[PDB]
């Protein structure tokens, strides 16, 4: 089940500390499908808080200690029983070592203690994979969880543009954003989350998709980190997986028996998330308190309206060949409290 580490041949494309970035790959020679998964794990946004992350979360800032292999799990598993959706695909795990929500385009230098190269890491992984078989692909699914899910939204159209400009117009680029669809909502108690993104973008030289940038304009690029604002600007097909009560959303909202004020807050959050997905035709949004799903081994277990996530993704593939009989692609729970769906993870 193992994916093998390859450090980037272009060693100018680096993790935060200047060590080379890389990717883990398991090829499937009989397949023209490629799954490129972006790991998540928050971010850091100034010298002091990146230094702390370097002390105790160093694998998210450096390749120096990465293992030579990783086991593929969930959507990265090659076992049909664990991955009914894409078990025969070529599998790529791209470690998150740039701490920039995959948006950065800044090298380490005499003025920069850290490199923030997430956007460039994605493009360099794609370039190097073209020499390893990606050139023959029919579908490239850029997937990701948490900050990696936001990274999908920020980067899927740039991957599509890169392959067009390199002369590969037959590769269909698509996105799968898991747990990366956040609300810039009012907190339950008062930390300034949107301010941290704004500061981060300046620290990272962060880049956002061009059409979204042109809408919000200079200084307001932080808006494009919020799915409901950036998604309408995207041209590539994007399937959105989002728990209605995402634990990271609750964290940025300062939410941890439940009285009326908090009950109303939680119910309003789920309703707002539901509302932002009403016109997202490929989506899976269960009424659960959880965080991430697609690379979890039991990702097969959750269902919305009787349809599992692997089935919904399979129906999405069919829709991209009018709605499909018994094969839905838009699956959003309507019940208003975490675990009102009996299939929620424990
Ligand atoms: C290596 O990466 C750097 C930084 O992204 C880029 O500017 C440069 O063109 C790359 N070199 C090659 C040979 O691909
Ligand atoms: C990008 N994000 C994560 O990786 C988890 C939480 C989310 C976020 C939203 C708003 C402000 N800061 C962070």
Q: What residues contact residue 139 under an 8 Å CB cut-off, 6+ apart?
A: 32, 33, 34, 171, 172, 174
Q: Domain residues for 328? A: 1-346
Angle between helices 118-130 and 147-165 (to 10 degrees): 50
Furthest-apart CA atoms within the chain: distance in Å: 60
Query: DSSP H helical segments within the chain, as ranges?
Result: 47-56, 118-130, 147-165, 193-204, 210-216, 227-230, 247-252, 260-276, 309-319
By what technique were these coordinates determined?
Answer: X-ray
Q: Which of 310, 309, 314 shows the shortest CA–CA distance to 331?
A: 309
Going from the C-alpha of 50 to that of each of 55, 63, 203, 290, the distances in angstroms are 9, 16, 11, 26
Cα(341) to centroid(ligand 1), Å: 48
Alpha-carbon gap, residue 169 to 240, rounded angstroms: 24
Phi, psi of 141 (to 5 degrees): -100, 110
Alpha-carbon gap, residue 251 to 193, rounded angstroms: 10
Alpha-carbon gap, residue 104 to 121, rounded angstroms: 9
Alpha-carbon gap, residue 180 to 299, rounded angstroms: 16
CA 203, chain centre distance (Å):
21
Q: Which ligand is nearest to the CA of 198?
A: 2
Q: What residues contact residue 120 under an 8 Å CB cut-off, 6+ apart?
A: 13, 104, 105
Q: b/e string for 1-29 if b means 16 or more Cβ within 10 A?
A: eebebbebeeeebbbbbbbbbbbbbbbbe
Are 18 and 108 within 8 A, CB to CB? yes
Cα(286) to centroid(ligand 2), Å: 19
Structure tokens at 283: 């989506």
Cα(29) to centroid(ligand 2), Å: 37
Going from the C-alpha of 271 to that of each of 75, 237, 264, 267, 336, the distances in angstroms are 28, 24, 10, 6, 7
Alpha-carbon gap, residue 24 to 295, rounded angstroms: 14
Phi, psi of 35 (to 5 degrees): -115, 115
Please identify which of the residues 178, 179, 253, 291 carries the catalytic annotation.
291
Q: Which of 50, 206, 74, 250 shows the shortest CA–CA distance to 145?
A: 74
Q: In DSSP terms, which residues pair with 176 in a beta bridge?
A: 143, 239
Alpha-carbon gap, residue 74 to 81, rounded angstroms: 10
Give 195's Cβ-side CA count (13 Å radius): 2
Please note each residue after which the chain is broken, C-to-N distance over 2.5 A, or write none.
190, 256, 321
Domain count, the chain: 1
Residue 88: other Cβ atoms inside 10 A: 12
321 counts as catalytic: no
Q: Which of 221, 234, 232, 11 shows the shortest CA–CA distance to 104?
A: 221
């Amino acid at each position: 089940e193992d994916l093998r580490l390859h450090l980037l041949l272009n060693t100018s494309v680096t993790c935060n500390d200047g060590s080379p970035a890389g990717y883990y790959l398991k090829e499937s020679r009989g397949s023209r499908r490629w799954l490129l998964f972006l790991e998540g794990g928050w971010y850091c946004f100034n010298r002091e808080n990146c230094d702390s992350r370097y002390d105790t979360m160093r694998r998210l800032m450096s390749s120096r200690d990465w293992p030579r292999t990783r086991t593929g799990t969930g959507i990265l598993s090659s076992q049909p029983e664990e991955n009914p959706y894409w078990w025969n695909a070529n599998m790529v795990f791209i470690p998150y070592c740039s701490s920039d929500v995959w948006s950065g385009a800044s090298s380490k230098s005499e003025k920069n203690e850290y490199a923030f190269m997430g956007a460039l890491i994605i493009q360099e992984v794609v370039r190097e994979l073209l020499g390893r078989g990606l050139s023959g692909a029919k579908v490239l699914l850029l997937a990701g969880s948490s900050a990696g899910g936001t990274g999908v939204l920020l980067n899927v159209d740039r991957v599509a543009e890169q392959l067009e400009k390199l002369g590969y117009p037959a590769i269909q680029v698509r996105g799968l954003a898991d747990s990366g669809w956040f609300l810039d909502n009012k907190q339950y108690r008062h930390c300034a989350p949107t301010e941290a993104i704004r500061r981060g973008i300046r620290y990272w030289n962060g880049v956002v998709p061009e059409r979204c940038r042109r809408q919000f304009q200079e200084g307001e690029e932080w808006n494009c980190f919020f799915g409901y604002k950036v998604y309408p600007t995207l041209r590539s097909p994007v399937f959105v997986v989002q728990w209605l009560f995402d634990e990271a959303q609750l964290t940025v909202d300062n939410v941890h028996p439940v009285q009326e004020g908090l009950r109303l807050y939680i119910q309003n959050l789920g309703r707002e998330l539901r509302h932002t997905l009403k016109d997202v035709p490929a989506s899976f949004a269960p009424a659960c308190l959880s965080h991430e799903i697609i690379i979890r081994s039991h990702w097969t277990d959750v269902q919305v309206k009787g349809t599992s996530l692997p089935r919904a993704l399979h129906c999405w593939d069919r829709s991209l060949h009018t709605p499909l009989k018994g094969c839905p692609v838009h699956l959003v729970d309507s019940c208003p409290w975490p675990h009102c769906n009996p299939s929620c993870p424990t």
